[PDB]
Amino acid sequence: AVQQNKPTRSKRGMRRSHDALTAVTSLSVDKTSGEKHLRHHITADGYYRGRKVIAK
Amino acid sequence: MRHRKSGRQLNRNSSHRQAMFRNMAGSLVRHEIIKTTLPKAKELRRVVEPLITLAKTDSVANRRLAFARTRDNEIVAKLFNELGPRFASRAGGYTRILKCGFRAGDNAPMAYIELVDRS
Amino acid sequence: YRTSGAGGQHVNRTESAVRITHIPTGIVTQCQNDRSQHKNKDQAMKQMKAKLYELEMQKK
Amino acid sequence: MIQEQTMLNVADNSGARRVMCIKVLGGSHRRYAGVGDIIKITIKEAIPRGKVKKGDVLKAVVVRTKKGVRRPDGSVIRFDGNACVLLNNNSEQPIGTRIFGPVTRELRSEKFMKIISLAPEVL
RNA sequence: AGGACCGAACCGACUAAUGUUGAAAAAUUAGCGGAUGACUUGUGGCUGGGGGUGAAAGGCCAAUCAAACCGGGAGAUAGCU
RNA sequence: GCUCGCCGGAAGACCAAGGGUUCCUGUCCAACGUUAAUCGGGGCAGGGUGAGUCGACCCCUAAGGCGAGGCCGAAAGGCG
RNA sequence: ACACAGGUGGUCAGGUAGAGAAUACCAAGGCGCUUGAGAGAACUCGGGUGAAGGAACUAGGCAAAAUGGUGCCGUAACUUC
RNA sequence: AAUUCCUUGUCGGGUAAGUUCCGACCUGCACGAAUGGCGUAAUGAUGGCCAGGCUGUCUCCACCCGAGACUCAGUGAAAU
RNA sequence: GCUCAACGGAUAAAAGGUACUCCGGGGAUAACAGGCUGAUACCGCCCAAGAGUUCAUAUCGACGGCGGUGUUUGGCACCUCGAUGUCGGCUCAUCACAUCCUGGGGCUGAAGUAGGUCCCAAGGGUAUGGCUGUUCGCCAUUUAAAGUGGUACGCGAGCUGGGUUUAGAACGUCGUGAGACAGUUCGGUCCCUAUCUGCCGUGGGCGCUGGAGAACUGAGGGGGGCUGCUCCUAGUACGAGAGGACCGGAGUGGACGCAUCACUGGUGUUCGGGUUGUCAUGCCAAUGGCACUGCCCGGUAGCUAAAUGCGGAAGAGAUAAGUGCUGAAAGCAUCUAAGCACGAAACUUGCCCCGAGAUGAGUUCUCCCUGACCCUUUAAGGGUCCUGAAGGAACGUUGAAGACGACGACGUUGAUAGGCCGGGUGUGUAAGCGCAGCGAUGCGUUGAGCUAACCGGUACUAAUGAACCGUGAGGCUUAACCU
Ligand SMILES: [Mg+2]
Ligand SMILES: [Mg+2]
């Protein structure tokens, strides 16, 4: 229900051990607008797989 | 478990899943491309990719499921008059999915759904 | 066995209630008079004995 | 599949009308029994003068089940009435004589060659 | 005609699940009883603590009642922790 | 803006009581808002309530409250 | 003590169905209730359906299930009629 | 017996089986006549007992519908 | 001048109730539980008066005697009173052996059948209801049997709250009374989001001394083990008959567990039909929203049991009790002492599952890497420029895989989903058009129309070029070979 002792801050490191984030490995570069974007996602400009998939 | 099943609850009851794809498919036919979330595109691949099966071929009696879960007849007048003859030879796959970043206020994964022959 | 007098853990948590029966005839005799079971068992020894003298008597 | 507390009808001319199973027999911890089976029953309703009496405790064989008995083709045989034929407690033979309604082929045995010979209809 | 009848509002709170760091310092959801009278509810008015009031249960008197609250005697007194 | 959904002897309109700027515009997003907020009953700055007939006041009076004198009571006061 | 599932008096009474100010669906009118978005395990909270059996369950048919309107026929004990 | 210790008194009923209940039995441990006695239609969110109907109460649980739980963002307590 | 007699004498002078209660404190002191103790209790043993016709010792055992158990009632007041929640139930249990069923024996006052008692044996099995808060018990009817105990007389941060044990109320009873009753009867709030330990699952890290991909071996651990009945042997043995077997064999059950959806069903709010009231689609005709999915009627896939397949072994070893064989000590006798055989659901195996973090990190099988230099505290050294393999992760499509993770399938060469065609499937003969009928409605097209999860196909869409990660022949020591 509730603890009987104060937990050690060293345990607090051990509980937060697996709690770390994870960044992106590599960004998919466009081949026409020539810019990095998310793999299997469109660019910020509206490009995907080279072509202009959406006029913004 | 949901072995061999098919259907996402979408955290909504079935009467609202009914009534939401009314307007969502009801406006995609209008503007030919819209911004929605990706599970409301991926469950909508069980919905809108069959809601273009709605858009196959004109009779008189085929004006009616496109009244039924749509409450609309103007969009009926767009489908079999213009879009039926548009997609006259495509045997499936009338759409395309564009995962377009995340929604601001809740980090919801958005996407663009659209038609294949938009231009 | 236990009696079901009022008091609880003085009553129900002890074996203050006795029952003495007969092997060849089958004549039970209980007692729950005082708190002690030997104020009951030995009393139920007397009451079965009081039945026992009547067994020849009621028959005859 | 008849458990306790189950009202059954009567299939012979014994005299009872309503019986009720109080014990499933024939096996250790045997929770259920279908046709071809023996149950201890009481009698809840009888005719004003018959072979029986309201409250007699005796055995019976189960002959018609609403639940169903299967055959090796896959065909399951259900009924619309749950009736039984009353037996002796000791000789364990049927007491009545005139069998009412149809019965099944699972009922036939050396113990029950007697009933099917008196049955009006055997499937 | 009725301290009549079924039953809304209204009024009560009998059962059950909830809830028990709550939506809520007693409530909701389902039902329930009364619902033309010994009815219910406004606006005021009056009764003050060994007193009040009470179809009475030590009930109620500003979320507190076998002696209200606030201030003072008063740093009551404590062979007790 | 387009549908959709709910309430509808109300989740609509209207007052008293009570609140006392919340009202209307402009501006701002630190805090406040159980998240963001470009928004707000938030901040800031401006506005905005017009009466012989409506209400109060006012003229009556009830329960009641006070009380000249008056009566009673150590005093304070009690009753009228 | 909160932008609190509470409490708070008066006035107002559209349509269809309906005895009705019940209920339903609605109009006028007003809102979608201040975290969302996923996933579709146990597990509780609510719900719906259930073979055969029908109280055996249990302290206890608790709750659930069931009954339900309007006419008409018919209606026992007993009665303080 | 809302009163009876013994006491599950005895008998009858009821049930397959009834420490309950309903009839008697009177041996009233320790009823009793306005701190009333006995009876009583109607009445009761009153106590106990029995039946029909009814059904996941149960045998013996299965399956779906939602609200959380779990995943990700934003915020972010508690008793100890 | 005082039974100041509670007699070193609180006052001349003083009774109660409190379950409406309250403070101050106490494990200095009660009630449960633990503790010690074992009187009592329970369970054995010794003696043998005798009973048992005779015959103590088949069966029993007077009078007595000796132990064991902690298990009854107790004793004690050591833990706990700045809290250790108790009766019964329910849910789950687990242990003991002093064994209830099953197993193995010995003796019998054991013909058989059936028992009696004793010993071995704890693998597995070991009722439902009526009554009552129940426990217990009685009863009914089962069963192979309905074991007994340890467990805070197991189990309330799991449930229940009937009983006891608050305040309300009443009787009987007691007291003048307020009130009280191991007297009853009616009514009466069961809180806690889990830090740790423990447990059930499921991951991450690093390790196993070049790296990677696999297959395993199996240390060790777990699961599992029940039984009736019928028939044969056989009416055989036995017995006078009645009755009725051993052993061996077959069949079918019960109960349990695993697997499963072909069947038989349930469910199937996403398939379909019927239908009520209302609202809207200009209006009819059609639909649709809402009304618990509005109310029904049904049904695919899936999930499911009540639906159907297995499962308990046989076998081996070593044995327990027990039976022996040779055989001295002990010219005989003698299962023991030397030797030696048999002997049970216990044991170890045989059965399945887990399993090399088995740090003792094992095994075999396959793939990858054969670039350059500086530094000084010269080595399992540090750094720099080329190189980036096997493969890996990441990302997307996804799953009869899943809380997440993990797992599995697939990413254009491609069938991974979705879509599409084909098919089946299920509601049950659509709409519109005719036709008849005053009409409601019926008939013609008509298993038509529709069709969720499904079966066969289809690249129609969505599964991206890359990049990332991991590198560049792998310590020392002898040893053995080869040169
Ligand atoms: Mg942490
Ligand atoms: Mg012994």
mmCIF file of all heavy atoms in Angstrom, chain B residues 37-72:
data_model
loop_
_atom_site.group_PDB
_atom_site.id
_atom_site.type_symbol
_atom_site.label_atom_id
_atom_site.label_comp_id
_atom_site.label_asym_id
_atom_site.label_seq_id
_atom_site.Cartn_x
_atom_site.Cartn_y
_atom_site.Cartn_z
ATOM 1 N N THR B 37 -6.176 11.681 -38.673
ATOM 2 C CA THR B 37 -5.162 10.949 -37.935
ATOM 3 C C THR B 37 -4.885 9.634 -38.635
ATOM 4 O O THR B 37 -5.674 9.162 -39.453
ATOM 5 C CB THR B 37 -5.596 10.661 -36.506
ATOM 6 O OG1 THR B 37 -6.435 9.502 -36.484
ATOM 7 C CG2 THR B 37 -6.370 11.850 -35.974
ATOM 8 N N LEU B 38 -3.754 9.036 -38.296
ATOM 9 C CA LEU B 38 -3.355 7.815 -38.984
ATOM 10 C C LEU B 38 -4.159 6.579 -38.574
ATOM 11 O O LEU B 38 -4.473 5.779 -39.470
ATOM 12 C CB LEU B 38 -1.843 7.623 -38.821
ATOM 13 C CG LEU B 38 -1.218 6.407 -39.483
ATOM 14 C CD1 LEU B 38 -1.388 6.497 -40.977
ATOM 15 C CD2 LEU B 38 0.243 6.324 -39.102
ATOM 16 N N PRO B 39 -4.533 6.345 -37.309
ATOM 17 C CA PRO B 39 -5.537 5.306 -37.047
ATOM 18 C C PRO B 39 -6.925 5.637 -37.556
ATOM 19 O O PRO B 39 -7.678 4.714 -37.878
ATOM 20 C CB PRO B 39 -5.527 5.181 -35.521
ATOM 21 C CG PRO B 39 -4.185 5.551 -35.149
ATOM 22 C CD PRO B 39 -3.836 6.682 -36.053
ATOM 23 N N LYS B 40 -7.291 6.912 -37.679
ATOM 24 C CA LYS B 40 -8.471 7.248 -38.467
ATOM 25 C C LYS B 40 -8.158 7.342 -39.944
ATOM 26 O O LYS B 40 -8.942 7.924 -40.693
ATOM 27 C CB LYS B 40 -9.085 8.575 -38.021
ATOM 28 C CG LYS B 40 -9.615 8.583 -36.613
ATOM 29 C CD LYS B 40 -10.099 9.963 -36.239
ATOM 30 C CE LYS B 40 -10.521 9.998 -34.786
ATOM 31 N NZ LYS B 40 -10.947 11.354 -34.347
ATOM 32 N N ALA B 41 -6.985 6.860 -40.350
ATOM 33 C CA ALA B 41 -6.757 6.490 -41.734
ATOM 34 C C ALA B 41 -6.587 4.979 -41.858
ATOM 35 O O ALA B 41 -7.066 4.379 -42.821
ATOM 36 C CB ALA B 41 -5.540 7.233 -42.278
ATOM 37 N N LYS B 42 -5.986 4.337 -40.851
ATOM 38 C CA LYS B 42 -5.677 2.912 -40.958
ATOM 39 C C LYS B 42 -6.879 2.021 -40.676
ATOM 40 O O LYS B 42 -7.058 1.014 -41.369
ATOM 41 C CB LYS B 42 -4.542 2.514 -40.013
ATOM 42 C CG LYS B 42 -3.146 2.965 -40.417
ATOM 43 C CD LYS B 42 -2.122 2.274 -39.518
ATOM 44 C CE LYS B 42 -0.695 2.665 -39.858
ATOM 45 N NZ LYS B 42 0.307 1.937 -39.023
ATOM 46 N N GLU B 43 -7.701 2.350 -39.678
ATOM 47 C CA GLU B 43 -9.032 1.762 -39.608
ATOM 48 C C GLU B 43 -9.913 2.261 -40.733
ATOM 49 O O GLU B 43 -10.811 1.543 -41.173
ATOM 50 C CB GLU B 43 -9.692 2.068 -38.252
ATOM 51 C CG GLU B 43 -11.146 1.571 -37.995
ATOM 52 C CD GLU B 43 -11.362 0.057 -38.132
ATOM 53 O OE1 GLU B 43 -10.404 -0.730 -38.029
ATOM 54 O OE2 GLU B 43 -12.526 -0.357 -38.331
ATOM 55 N N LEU B 44 -9.615 3.443 -41.250
ATOM 56 C CA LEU B 44 -10.349 3.958 -42.381
ATOM 57 C C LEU B 44 -9.919 3.268 -43.670
ATOM 58 O O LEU B 44 -10.574 3.426 -44.701
ATOM 59 C CB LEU B 44 -10.128 5.452 -42.437
ATOM 60 C CG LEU B 44 -11.126 6.316 -43.146
ATOM 61 C CD1 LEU B 44 -12.436 6.375 -42.363
ATOM 62 C CD2 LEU B 44 -10.556 7.685 -43.488
ATOM 63 N N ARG B 45 -8.814 2.508 -43.633
ATOM 64 C CA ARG B 45 -8.496 1.592 -44.725
ATOM 65 C C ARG B 45 -9.422 0.387 -44.728
ATOM 66 O O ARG B 45 -9.587 -0.267 -45.762
ATOM 67 C CB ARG B 45 -7.052 1.107 -44.624
ATOM 68 C CG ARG B 45 -6.024 2.165 -44.847
ATOM 69 C CD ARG B 45 -4.630 1.613 -44.718
ATOM 70 N NE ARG B 45 -4.369 1.029 -43.405
ATOM 71 C CZ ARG B 45 -3.207 0.494 -43.052
ATOM 72 N NH1 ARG B 45 -2.198 0.501 -43.906
ATOM 73 N NH2 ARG B 45 -3.046 -0.028 -41.846
ATOM 74 N N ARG B 46 -10.001 0.059 -43.578
ATOM 75 C CA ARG B 46 -11.133 -0.850 -43.521
ATOM 76 C C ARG B 46 -12.446 -0.143 -43.781
ATOM 77 O O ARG B 46 -13.491 -0.803 -43.796
ATOM 78 C CB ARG B 46 -11.248 -1.523 -42.159
ATOM 79 C CG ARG B 46 -10.157 -2.463 -41.736
ATOM 80 C CD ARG B 46 -10.515 -3.036 -40.364
ATOM 81 N NE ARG B 46 -11.652 -3.967 -40.407
ATOM 82 C CZ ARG B 46 -12.897 -3.694 -40.016
ATOM 83 N NH1 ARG B 46 -13.213 -2.494 -39.563
ATOM 84 N NH2 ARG B 46 -13.833 -4.631 -40.098
ATOM 85 N N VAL B 47 -12.431 1.178 -43.959
ATOM 86 C CA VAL B 47 -13.646 1.960 -44.132
ATOM 87 C C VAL B 47 -13.645 2.707 -45.459
ATOM 88 O O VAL B 47 -14.426 2.386 -46.354
ATOM 89 C CB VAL B 47 -13.857 2.932 -42.948
ATOM 90 C CG1 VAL B 47 -15.082 3.786 -43.175
ATOM 91 C CG2 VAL B 47 -13.986 2.180 -41.639
ATOM 92 N N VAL B 48 -12.724 3.656 -45.636
ATOM 93 C CA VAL B 48 -12.766 4.487 -46.837
ATOM 94 C C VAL B 48 -12.302 3.705 -48.052
ATOM 95 O O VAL B 48 -12.893 3.820 -49.132
ATOM 96 C CB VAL B 48 -11.995 5.802 -46.628
ATOM 97 C CG1 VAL B 48 -11.379 6.339 -47.922
ATOM 98 C CG2 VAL B 48 -13.007 6.846 -46.160
ATOM 99 N N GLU B 49 -11.311 2.834 -47.882
ATOM 100 C CA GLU B 49 -10.945 1.949 -48.980
ATOM 101 C C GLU B 49 -12.076 0.985 -49.361
ATOM 102 O O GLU B 49 -12.168 0.646 -50.554
ATOM 103 C CB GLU B 49 -9.629 1.229 -48.635
ATOM 104 C CG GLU B 49 -8.481 2.193 -48.438
ATOM 105 C CD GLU B 49 -7.168 1.519 -48.116
ATOM 106 O OE1 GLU B 49 -7.156 0.305 -47.860
ATOM 107 O OE2 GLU B 49 -6.130 2.206 -48.132
ATOM 108 N N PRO B 50 -12.964 0.560 -48.455
ATOM 109 C CA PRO B 50 -14.311 0.131 -48.865
ATOM 110 C C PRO B 50 -15.319 1.244 -49.138
ATOM 111 O O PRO B 50 -16.322 0.984 -49.807
ATOM 112 C CB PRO B 50 -14.774 -0.711 -47.665
ATOM 113 C CG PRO B 50 -13.548 -1.204 -47.049
ATOM 114 C CD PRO B 50 -12.579 -0.097 -47.189
ATOM 115 N N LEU B 51 -15.164 2.473 -48.656
ATOM 116 C CA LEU B 51 -16.106 3.513 -49.062
ATOM 117 C C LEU B 51 -15.833 4.050 -50.457
ATOM 118 O O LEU B 51 -16.528 4.966 -50.902
ATOM 119 C CB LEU B 51 -16.102 4.672 -48.062
ATOM 120 C CG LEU B 51 -17.088 4.834 -46.899
ATOM 121 C CD1 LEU B 51 -18.406 5.301 -47.445
ATOM 122 C CD2 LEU B 51 -17.338 3.584 -46.098
ATOM 123 N N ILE B 52 -14.806 3.544 -51.143
ATOM 124 C CA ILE B 52 -14.698 3.793 -52.574
ATOM 125 C C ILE B 52 -15.272 2.612 -53.347
ATOM 126 O O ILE B 52 -15.633 2.733 -54.527
ATOM 127 C CB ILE B 52 -13.239 4.077 -52.962
ATOM 128 C CG1 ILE B 52 -12.646 5.118 -52.024
ATOM 129 C CG2 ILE B 52 -13.187 4.722 -54.327
ATOM 130 C CD1 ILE B 52 -11.126 5.182 -52.061
ATOM 131 N N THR B 53 -15.365 1.447 -52.700
ATOM 132 C CA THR B 53 -16.198 0.376 -53.238
ATOM 133 C C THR B 53 -17.653 0.824 -53.337
ATOM 134 O O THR B 53 -18.375 0.418 -54.259
ATOM 135 C CB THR B 53 -16.024 -0.881 -52.376
ATOM 136 O OG1 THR B 53 -14.690 -1.380 -52.526
ATOM 137 C CG2 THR B 53 -17.045 -1.969 -52.683
ATOM 138 N N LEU B 54 -18.076 1.717 -52.440
ATOM 139 C CA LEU B 54 -19.281 2.511 -52.627
ATOM 140 C C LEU B 54 -19.326 3.228 -53.972
ATOM 141 O O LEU B 54 -20.389 3.272 -54.600
ATOM 142 C CB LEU B 54 -19.368 3.539 -51.508
ATOM 143 C CG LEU B 54 -20.587 4.446 -51.496
ATOM 144 C CD1 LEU B 54 -21.840 3.669 -51.112
ATOM 145 C CD2 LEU B 54 -20.356 5.611 -50.571
ATOM 146 N N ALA B 55 -18.198 3.726 -54.457
ATOM 147 C CA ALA B 55 -18.142 4.449 -55.713
ATOM 148 C C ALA B 55 -17.842 3.560 -56.912
ATOM 149 O O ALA B 55 -16.825 3.780 -57.571
ATOM 150 C CB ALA B 55 -17.088 5.553 -55.626
ATOM 151 N N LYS B 56 -18.652 2.542 -57.198
ATOM 152 C CA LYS B 56 -18.345 1.713 -58.357
ATOM 153 C C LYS B 56 -19.108 2.045 -59.640
ATOM 154 O O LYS B 56 -18.468 2.402 -60.631
ATOM 155 C CB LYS B 56 -18.541 0.246 -58.005
ATOM 156 C CG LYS B 56 -17.354 -0.268 -57.250
ATOM 157 C CD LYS B 56 -17.498 -1.715 -56.921
ATOM 158 C CE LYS B 56 -16.254 -2.185 -56.235
ATOM 159 N NZ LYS B 56 -16.383 -3.570 -55.723
ATOM 160 N N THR B 57 -20.435 1.917 -59.684
ATOM 161 C CA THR B 57 -21.155 1.904 -60.971
ATOM 162 C C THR B 57 -22.591 2.387 -60.743
ATOM 163 O O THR B 57 -23.216 2.036 -59.743
ATOM 164 C CB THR B 57 -21.099 0.502 -61.588
ATOM 165 O OG1 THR B 57 -19.744 0.162 -61.915
ATOM 166 C CG2 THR B 57 -21.946 0.376 -62.845
ATOM 167 N N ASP B 58 -23.103 3.197 -61.677
ATOM 168 C CA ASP B 58 -24.420 3.830 -61.561
ATOM 169 C C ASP B 58 -25.544 2.920 -62.047
ATOM 170 O O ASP B 58 -25.547 2.406 -63.168
ATOM 171 C CB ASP B 58 -24.450 5.140 -62.330
ATOM 172 C CG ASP B 58 -25.763 5.863 -62.169
ATOM 173 O OD1 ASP B 58 -25.987 6.466 -61.100
ATOM 174 O OD2 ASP B 58 -26.583 5.804 -63.104
ATOM 175 N N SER B 59 -26.515 2.720 -61.164
ATOM 176 C CA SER B 59 -27.877 2.374 -61.536
ATOM 177 C C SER B 59 -28.832 3.425 -60.986
ATOM 178 O O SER B 59 -28.435 4.523 -60.600
ATOM 179 C CB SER B 59 -28.277 1.009 -61.003
ATOM 180 O OG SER B 59 -28.493 1.088 -59.606
ATOM 181 N N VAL B 60 -30.120 3.090 -60.975
ATOM 182 C CA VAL B 60 -31.043 3.912 -60.204
ATOM 183 C C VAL B 60 -31.007 3.522 -58.736
ATOM 184 O O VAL B 60 -30.967 4.385 -57.852
ATOM 185 C CB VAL B 60 -32.459 3.796 -60.789
ATOM 186 C CG1 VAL B 60 -33.443 4.573 -59.955
ATOM 187 C CG2 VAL B 60 -32.468 4.305 -62.211
ATOM 188 N N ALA B 61 -30.938 2.224 -58.455
ATOM 189 C CA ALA B 61 -31.027 1.760 -57.077
ATOM 190 C C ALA B 61 -29.688 1.870 -56.371
ATOM 191 O O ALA B 61 -29.611 1.726 -55.147
ATOM 192 C CB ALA B 61 -31.536 0.323 -57.044
ATOM 193 N N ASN B 62 -28.627 2.134 -57.113
ATOM 194 C CA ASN B 62 -27.338 2.338 -56.477
ATOM 195 C C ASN B 62 -27.116 3.768 -56.034
ATOM 196 O O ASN B 62 -25.963 4.184 -55.911
ATOM 197 C CB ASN B 62 -26.211 1.912 -57.404
ATOM 198 C CG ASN B 62 -26.172 0.428 -57.600
ATOM 199 O OD1 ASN B 62 -26.304 -0.070 -58.711
ATOM 200 N ND2 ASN B 62 -26.029 -0.298 -56.509
ATOM 201 N N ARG B 63 -28.179 4.529 -55.812
ATOM 202 C CA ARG B 63 -28.014 5.861 -55.261
ATOM 203 C C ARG B 63 -28.268 5.877 -53.762
ATOM 204 O O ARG B 63 -28.594 6.930 -53.201
ATOM 205 C CB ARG B 63 -28.964 6.824 -55.963
ATOM 206 C CG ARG B 63 -28.791 6.895 -57.468
ATOM 207 C CD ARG B 63 -27.454 7.504 -57.832
ATOM 208 N NE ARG B 63 -27.294 7.709 -59.267
ATOM 209 C CZ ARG B 63 -27.629 8.828 -59.898
ATOM 210 N NH1 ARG B 63 -28.141 9.845 -59.224
ATOM 211 N NH2 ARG B 63 -27.447 8.930 -61.206
ATOM 212 N N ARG B 64 -28.144 4.732 -53.091
ATOM 213 C CA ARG B 64 -28.918 4.585 -51.868
ATOM 214 C C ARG B 64 -28.103 4.290 -50.619
ATOM 215 O O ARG B 64 -28.403 4.870 -49.569
ATOM 216 C CB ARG B 64 -29.984 3.508 -52.063
ATOM 217 C CG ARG B 64 -31.289 4.059 -52.622
ATOM 218 C CD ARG B 64 -31.280 4.346 -54.117
ATOM 219 N NE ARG B 64 -32.516 4.999 -54.523
ATOM 220 C CZ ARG B 64 -33.610 4.354 -54.903
ATOM 221 N NH1 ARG B 64 -33.616 3.031 -54.962
ATOM 222 N NH2 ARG B 64 -34.699 5.034 -55.235
ATOM 223 N N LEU B 65 -27.074 3.435 -50.678
ATOM 224 C CA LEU B 65 -26.170 3.344 -49.530
ATOM 225 C C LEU B 65 -25.374 4.625 -49.385
ATOM 226 O O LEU B 65 -24.966 5.002 -48.280
ATOM 227 C CB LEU B 65 -25.214 2.158 -49.640
ATOM 228 C CG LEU B 65 -25.644 0.782 -49.140
ATOM 229 C CD1 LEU B 65 -26.532 0.092 -50.161
ATOM 230 C CD2 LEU B 65 -24.432 -0.069 -48.772
ATOM 231 N N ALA B 66 -25.155 5.312 -50.505
ATOM 232 C CA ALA B 66 -24.562 6.633 -50.455
ATOM 233 C C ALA B 66 -25.581 7.685 -50.041
ATOM 234 O O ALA B 66 -25.215 8.840 -49.829
ATOM 235 C CB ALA B 66 -23.943 6.966 -51.809
ATOM 236 N N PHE B 67 -26.855 7.322 -49.903
ATOM 237 C CA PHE B 67 -27.677 8.145 -49.036
ATOM 238 C C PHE B 67 -27.595 7.663 -47.598
ATOM 239 O O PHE B 67 -27.648 8.481 -46.671
ATOM 240 C CB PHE B 67 -29.135 8.173 -49.486
ATOM 241 C CG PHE B 67 -30.016 8.946 -48.544
ATOM 242 C CD1 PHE B 67 -29.952 10.329 -48.499
ATOM 243 C CD2 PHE B 67 -30.857 8.294 -47.653
ATOM 244 C CE1 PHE B 67 -30.737 11.049 -47.612
ATOM 245 C CE2 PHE B 67 -31.636 9.003 -46.755
ATOM 246 C CZ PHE B 67 -31.580 10.381 -46.736
ATOM 247 N N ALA B 68 -27.394 6.357 -47.404
ATOM 248 C CA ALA B 68 -27.789 5.707 -46.157
ATOM 249 C C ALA B 68 -26.892 6.110 -44.993
ATOM 250 O O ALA B 68 -27.365 6.695 -44.011
ATOM 251 C CB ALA B 68 -27.781 4.192 -46.336
ATOM 252 N N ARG B 69 -25.592 5.833 -45.093
ATOM 253 C CA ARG B 69 -24.691 6.269 -44.033
ATOM 254 C C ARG B 69 -24.052 7.607 -44.347
ATOM 255 O O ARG B 69 -22.961 7.882 -43.847
ATOM 256 C CB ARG B 69 -23.578 5.243 -43.797
ATOM 257 C CG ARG B 69 -23.959 3.940 -43.089
ATOM 258 C CD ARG B 69 -24.156 4.146 -41.583
ATOM 259 N NE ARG B 69 -24.365 2.888 -40.859
ATOM 260 C CZ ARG B 69 -23.406 2.194 -40.248
ATOM 261 N NH1 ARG B 69 -22.159 2.645 -40.232
ATOM 262 N NH2 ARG B 69 -23.700 1.064 -39.624
ATOM 263 N N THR B 70 -24.699 8.436 -45.164
ATOM 264 C CA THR B 70 -24.149 9.726 -45.552
ATOM 265 C C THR B 70 -25.087 10.872 -45.253
ATOM 266 O O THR B 70 -24.620 11.992 -45.027
ATOM 267 C CB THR B 70 -23.849 9.770 -47.047
ATOM 268 O OG1 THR B 70 -25.090 9.770 -47.761
ATOM 269 C CG2 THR B 70 -23.017 8.573 -47.479
ATOM 270 N N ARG B 71 -26.398 10.606 -45.283
ATOM 271 C CA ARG B 71 -27.471 11.598 -45.139
ATOM 272 C C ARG B 71 -27.360 12.677 -46.202
ATOM 273 O O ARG B 71 -27.727 13.833 -45.989
ATOM 274 C CB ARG B 71 -27.495 12.225 -43.743
ATOM 275 C CG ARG B 71 -27.470 11.202 -42.650
ATOM 276 C CD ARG B 71 -28.646 10.271 -42.797
ATOM 277 N NE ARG B 71 -29.943 10.912 -42.583
ATOM 278 C CZ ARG B 71 -30.552 10.968 -41.402
ATOM 279 N NH1 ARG B 71 -29.992 10.373 -40.355
ATOM 280 N NH2 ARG B 71 -31.736 11.549 -41.273
ATOM 281 N N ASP B 72 -26.838 12.303 -47.361
ATOM 282 C CA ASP B 72 -26.513 13.306 -48.359
ATOM 283 C C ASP B 72 -26.816 12.733 -49.725
ATOM 284 O O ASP B 72 -26.732 11.517 -49.924
ATOM 285 C CB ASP B 72 -25.058 13.725 -48.240
ATOM 286 C CG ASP B 72 -24.741 14.989 -49.021
ATOM 287 O OD1 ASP B 72 -25.590 15.486 -49.793
ATOM 288 O OD2 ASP B 72 -23.636 15.523 -48.819
#
